[PDB]
Every structure is written in C-alpha cells, then in structure tokens.
Structure of Pathogenesis related 10-10 C59S mutant:
Amino acid sequence: GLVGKLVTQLEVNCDADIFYKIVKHHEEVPNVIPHFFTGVQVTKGDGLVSGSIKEWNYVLEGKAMTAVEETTHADETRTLTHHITEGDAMKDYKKFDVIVETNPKPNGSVVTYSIVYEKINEDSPAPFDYLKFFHQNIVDMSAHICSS
Amino acid sequence: GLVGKLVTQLEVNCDADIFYKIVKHHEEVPNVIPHFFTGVQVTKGDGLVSGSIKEWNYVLEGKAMTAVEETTHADETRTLTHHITEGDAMKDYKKFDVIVETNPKPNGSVVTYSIVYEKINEDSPAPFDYLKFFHQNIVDMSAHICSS
C-alpha cells in the first residue's frame, strides 16, 4: 500500500529512437491545458545541456498546483526521468518519480510511462490522477505524428 | 493509443507463495461494493478444479455492469489470469485481460495487476476506472492480513 508503481504502456507506430527524440524535446503538456514553467538547464561538463530543473505551474483536474522537477535522460536506453522534489504531489508522496521509456516492439514501438511512488501514509491516494494526465498527454502528442 | 497495458504494482509484507494462495482463493471484491456472480468451475481432466467461468454483476463508479470472465492460474509462476469475453467492458475493448502476478522482492513481495487491452476505436477510454477498482480491492484485501 505504501510503496508502488503505476504504469501506462502504449503502442506507437514509430521507430523507437525517432520517437524518443520527439518525446525528449517536446513539452509533455498540450497548450489547451493551463500550464507554464520557469527554471534552468543542467549541463554535464562539456557545456552541453543534459537536463533541466523546472518549476511547473499547472492545473490538474481543475486544481492549480506546482511541482519542482529535475529531468535527466539516457539516450542509450531511450529513457527520460522526471524526479519531483517539491510541490503539491509532495503533500501526498515521500517520493514521486516519472520514468518514460521507448523501445522497439519485439515485432513500431512501445512507450512506457511509470510513476514510482511512496506515500506519506495510508490515507494518501495512489497517483491515478497523474497517470491519466500523462497518458492523455502522450496520446495527444502521438496523435499529431504520422508516417513519412 | 489502440493497444496498451495499465499496471498497478504494490509491495506487500507477505511471502510471495503464501500471498498468491490468498489472492487465488479470495473474492477480489469487498462486500461493501455491490456485486455477485454465477457460473461454473473448470477442471483439467484429473477432476481437480483449475479455473472458473463466471458472470459477474457489479457496480463500478455507480453504474451497474456485467462481465463474463474465465479465470486460469499458473502456480509455478504465481500468476492468475482473468480473460473477459463479454459484457460492458466489451463495448469499449476488443480485448480485455487482467493478469495478477506475485513475486518475492529482490530484497516481502511485489503484487502486479496488469490490464492488457485493445480499444474498439480511438474514442474508447483506457481502463483507468478498472485499474483503480482493482487497486483499491487488493489494498483492501491486504489491509486485512498481518504477520504471524
């Protein structure tokens, strides 16, 4: 009950490496949803950007919220990670991390969004509201991509 | 968007084989939720029960629904499978299967409920309502188990 993971996995008709590069450089929130962020980019030492630290302001199921999150990526495994350190979600969770992976189908690709969480206590909900939000956002992004 | 999988994974403080035997023989719906089933048991040939075929009547998010499902199990892998063939969910999904796995932590156990689905069309929702229902049901079951 206290430690868990929620996952939404979707099949997309796109090469895994190409789709990963699309997800990596696209804002995961459509413009119709109220949101913006401020923050910084993170570099690795050679001066190239390797990630970001952002304070998001967004509206989820009608309620305005804030989150501070550090994003990192691993190109070799086509994995993006968002590590939330502060904000409304931290009233419910001791830990809240969002992991986005893209892999070729064993046969297009499979995209997996995982929310790895630890609740503050048993009265805390599991993050189904966030899972649906991330799901609908990635479906919206994928609906605007097509072949050729 | 059309083919996907939703997962809820929970850590439980229980031996994996013991917990699997508890899940295997317990009604996955608490009595406070309106529900009942009719149906049959399935045998493998030696006369021992290996599964069931049930017609469930239940109320989900206030709406009365029906499902026909065949349950099978694999003791060796501590896996239970519910294969839905008919009912309200089939108005939204061409395929709807619920897979419940229990495994020892690499360190208790990890219980995974997966809903493997294929939508009829793009207007169909993903089964977040079912994921939350199964999640809360397994949390309720686990809350009534303790050590010793």
